[PDB]
Design a protein that fits this description.
Strands 3-2-4-1-5-6-7-8 form an 8-stranded mixed β-sheet, sandwiched between helices. It folds into 2 domains: 89 residues, Four Helix Bundle (Hemerythrin (Met), subunit A), CATH 1.20.120.140; 209 residues, Rossmann fold (3-Layer(aba) Sandwich). The chain has 298 residues and is of the alpha/beta class. Belongs to the GTP-binding SRP family. It is a peripheral membrane protein.
Length: 298
């Protein structure tokens, strides 16, 4: 619904596929597939996934598995859905307490804001949440997390400039000691990835691991959806260095770049867990791969 709006422009642009398929027959296959390829590329499906999708269609058309435009269209949706769920999209918090979640990302992605929206969700499900203001680089983020703490009725551990790993260590200790269900940890926001940032994220992961075996449970990377395919290198860097368990794609408002969602998940094998489709608190939503594929293809 809100996912339909989040990618409204992608849907509009991908609609050309239905028109092209009106002109499909076996002899027209390669011409139709050339146009279909161009349409996916226009909507920010990466080259690797576009060729994979198109060549499989061509295969299945040639072998006689696919015999009509409607069958080809549904096969296209199936290929895309399969790349998305090749996926545990849910938060994987287990049973041992406390669960520890780290939120990471660069400036402009809504890192801190999403952590607040997430805390709202968990609080509403009756989960006992402690916040940790580990974004030590940005003073405005810490203050914003105190505002979120007050709105959602979470307690919050704040820095007393602090080392993020020390704040997180403190919050998780208090989590465990005071019987919390989840410790929800912010981390430092920078304009671009750099060495200093990666070193600090490594330290935070080690520091919370020392207090609770297997912590953190989730390391969620927040990314502005509007960056499209340019999010691939950065997600790969966070993943190679830190180990990301889930993505949060934000700032979607009739994005024309919906293909980037499939491209990132397929490339790195990290599921999209939440999508941000608006500025209200409820507008951070659990990702539903089948609903998404319907939202972009009809």
């Amino acid at each position: 619904e809100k996912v339909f709006s989040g990618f409204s422009k992608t849907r509009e642009n991908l609609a050309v596929i239905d028109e092209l398929l009106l002109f499909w027959n076996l002899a027209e296959t390669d011409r139709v597939l050339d146009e279909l390829e161009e349409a996916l590329l226009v909507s920010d499906f990466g080259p690797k996934i576009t060729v994979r999708i198109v060549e499989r269609l061509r295969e299945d058309i040639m072998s006689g598995k696919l015999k009509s435009g409607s069958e080809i269209k549904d096969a296209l949706k199936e290929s895309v859905l399969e790349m998305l769920a090749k996926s545990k999209t849910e938060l994987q918090l287990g049973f041992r307490k406390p669960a520890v979640i780290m939120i990471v990302g660069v400036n402009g992605g809504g890192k801190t804001t999403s952590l607040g929206k997430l805390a709202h969700r968990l609080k509403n499900e009756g989960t006992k949440v402690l916040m940790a203001a580990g974004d030590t680089f940005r003073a405005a983020a810490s203050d914003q997390l105190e505002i979120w703490a007050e709105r959602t009725g979470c307690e919050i551990v704040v820095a007393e400039k602090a080392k993020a790993a020390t704040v997180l260590s403190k919050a998780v200790k208090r989590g465990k000691e005071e019987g919390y269900d989840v410790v929800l940890c912010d981390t430092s926001g920078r304009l671009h990835t750099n060495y200093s940032l990666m070193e600090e994220l490594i330290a935070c992961k080690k520091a919370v691991g020392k207090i609770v075996s297997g912590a953190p449970n989730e390391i969620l990377l927040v990314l502005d959806g509007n960056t499209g395919l340019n999010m691939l290198p950065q997600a790969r860097e966070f993943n190679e260095v830190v180990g990301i368990t889930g993505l949060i794609l934000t700032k979607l408002d009739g994005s024309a770049r919906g293909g980037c969602v499939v491209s990132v998940v397929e490339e790195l094998g990290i599921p999209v867990k939440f999508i941000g489709v608006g500025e209200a608190v409820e507008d951070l939503q659990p990702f539903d791969p089948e609903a998404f594929v319907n939202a972009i293809f009809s």
